[PDB]
Amino acid sequence: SWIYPTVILCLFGFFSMMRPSEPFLIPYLSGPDKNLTSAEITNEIFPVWTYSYLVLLLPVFVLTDYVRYKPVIILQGISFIITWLLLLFGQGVKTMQVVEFFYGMVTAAEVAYYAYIYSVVSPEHYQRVSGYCRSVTLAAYTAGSVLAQLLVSLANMSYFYLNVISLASVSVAFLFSLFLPMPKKSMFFHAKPWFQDLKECYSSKRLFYWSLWWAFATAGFNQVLNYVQILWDYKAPSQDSSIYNGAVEAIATFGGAVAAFAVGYVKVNWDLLGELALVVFSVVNAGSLFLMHYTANIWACYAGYLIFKSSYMLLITIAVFQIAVNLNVERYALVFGINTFIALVIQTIMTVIVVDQRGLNLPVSIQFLVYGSYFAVIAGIFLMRSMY
Ligand SMILES: Cc1ncc(C[n+]2csc(CCO)c2C)c(N)n1
């Protein structure tokens, strides 16, 4: 059968991604509860996340197939508990970097969470259970941001209690994570009957350029998803007017879900339109990031994030569809693992150069000009490849 591990995995997926304090994190740190300047948050604290998601990406896969997918989720649950407990009680510029380290390990073990599906389930429901679990996680994050902003704007709720709610939700997620079945076989190591065949994998012109774009777009979206809240804080601090972070990130994630639903139900010639459909929405992404940089009204920057996140989820779902058709299931996770490693190398290089003190030590203003130029260079590369 398949239904019980699906139900426990979707319960873990709902109560993990219900993090109501997640949109309001940058008003929580720079707010009156802590003594943290926004220069130290922009330039010393958040880049550690990218660092911790590079150095702990490749070992976690090694600690995924060997433990056959169960205890890495339990490590993610312990990571949840440690991260939000340190968000509750932790003080200083030193402890908040440890927070970013453990949040990097959270983002690392998310891949093992998704990879448990093809390990425990009988192969008749490889399509059904994965789409179910991903939909449950997306609905969890959307409803979490909805409940967050409603409780804040209509409940006089300080942010510390919202982190308490987040701790409780990820703690309940840790209590569901223990009650999963250890699967019978893994996907690479513990299969009872690959380096030399790996050159044959990326020897495909329909699979290299799309993977390269997935890497650059994933790095850019992780950067923008990091620093968009510090940009929102810079445009209008939380002590002036009560900003609406949870509602806008909720509508943005809902639009991302609508875009991902809209990718798989449009029947046009993909090779002919794809030399244009990538280009126009890449221009949309570049214009959205430029719009968030140049503006001074806060709803204009919110609308820039809405248009950017919907356009990214559109184009990156198109990319995931244009990779997945050719290969099998076992090669799919290896290809996306190498692609994710390349994306985090690119994001680490760009975060050392642009963001951190070892590079330029930039404020959050000029940063989004650089990220908009990065996606504009991406759109120019697509325009040049259409011109070939
Ligand atoms: C503890 C912690 N939380 C969030 C971020 C930044 N961040 C990563 S993803 C995301 C939104 C996901 O939809 C945000 C705001 C961070 N650096 N550390």
From Swiss-Prot:
Tissue distribution: Widely expressed but most abundant in placenta, kidney and liver.
Glycosylation site residues: 35, 156
Family indicated by similarity: Belongs to the reduced folate carrier (RFC) transporter (TC 2.A.48) family.
Listed InterPro entries: Folate_carrier, MFS_trans_sf, ThTr-2
Transmembrane segments annotated in the record for this chain: 1-18, 44-64, 72-92, 101-121, 135-155, 160-180, 212-232, 246-266, 272-292, 305-325, 335-355, 364-384
Function noted in UniProt: Mediates high affinity thiamine uptake, probably via a proton anti-port mechanism. Has no folate transport activity. Mediates H(+)-dependent pyridoxine transport.
BP term (GO), one: thiamine-containing compound metabolic process
Membrane topology of this protein: Multi-pass membrane protein
Signal peptide location: none
Protein name per Swiss-Prot or TrEMBL: Thiamine transporter 2
Catalytic activity: thiamine(out) + H(+)(in) = thiamine(in) + H(+)(out); pyridoxine(out) + n H(+)(out) = pyridoxine(in) + n H(+)(in)
Subcellular locations according to the entry: Membrane
Extracellular topological segments: 19-43, 93-100, 156-159, 233-245, 293-304, 356-363
GO cellular component: membrane; plasma membrane
